[PDB]
Amino acid sequence: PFFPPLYLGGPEITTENCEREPIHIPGSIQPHGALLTADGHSGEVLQMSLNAATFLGQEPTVLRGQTLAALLPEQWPALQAALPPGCPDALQYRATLDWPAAGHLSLTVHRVGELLILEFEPTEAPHALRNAMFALESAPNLRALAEVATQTVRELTGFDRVMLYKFAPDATGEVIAEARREGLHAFLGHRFPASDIPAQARALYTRHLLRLTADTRAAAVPLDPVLNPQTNAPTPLGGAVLRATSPMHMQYLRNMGVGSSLSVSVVVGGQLWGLIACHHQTPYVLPPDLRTTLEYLGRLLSLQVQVKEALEH
Ligand X SMILES: *C/C=C1/C(=C/c2[nH]c(/C=C3[NH+]=C(/C=C4\NC(=O)C(C=C)=C4C)C(C)=C\3CCC(=O)O)c(CCC(=O)O)c2C)NC(=O)[C@H]1C
* The only residue of 9, 100, 130, 312 in contact with its own copies, by rule CB under 8 A: 130
* The only residue of 59, 98, 100, 138 in contact with its own copies, by rule CB under 8 A: 138
DSSP code per residue over 200-239: HHHHHHHHS-EEEES-TTPPPEEEESSEETTTTEEPP-TT
- Tell me which of ligand X, its own copies, none is bound by residue 82, counting a contact when its beta carbon lies within the kind-specific cut-off of 5 to 8 angstroms: its own copies
* The only residue of 19, 147, 295, 309 in contact with its own copies, by rule CB under 8 A: 295
Report 179-218 residues binding ligand X (CB under 6 A).
187, 192, 195-198, 201, 211, 213
**Does 296 interact with ligand X (rule: CB under 6 A)?**
no
Query: Which is nearer to ligand X, 25 or 45 (by Cβ)?
Result: 25
Q: Which stretch binds its own copies (CB under 8 A): 21-29, 32-40, 89-97, 166-174?
A: 89-97
Query: Which is nearer to ligand X, 14 or 141 (by Cβ)?
Result: 14
**Does 96 interact with its own copies (rule: CB under 8 A)?**
yes
Q: Is 271 exposed, middle or buried (0-12, 13-18, 19+ CB in 10 A)?
A: exposed
Query: Which is nearer to ligand X, 68 or 277 (by Cβ)?
Result: 277
Q: Is 18 annotated as a binding residue?
A: yes
**Does 88 interact with its own copies (rule: CB under 8 A)?**
yes
**Does 291 interact with ligand X (rule: CB under 6 A)?**
no
- Tell me which of ligand X, its own copies, none is bound by residue 192, counting a contact when its beta carbon lies within the kind-specific cut-off of 5 to 8 angstroms: ligand X
**Taking CB under 6 A as the rule, which mask of x and - marks residues 220-249 in contact with ligand X?**
-------------------------xx-xx
**Does 274 interact with ligand X (rule: CB under 6 A)?**
no
Size, binding site for ligand X by CB under 6 A: 24
Q: Cis check for the bond before 247: say yes or no (omega within 30 of 0).
A: no
Binding residues for a tetrapyrrole: 18
Binding residues: 18
Q: What is the binding site for its own copies (CB under 8 A)?
A: 82, 87-88, 90-96, 126-127, 129-131, 133-135, 137-138, 269-270, 292, 295-296, 299-300, 302-303, 306-307, 310
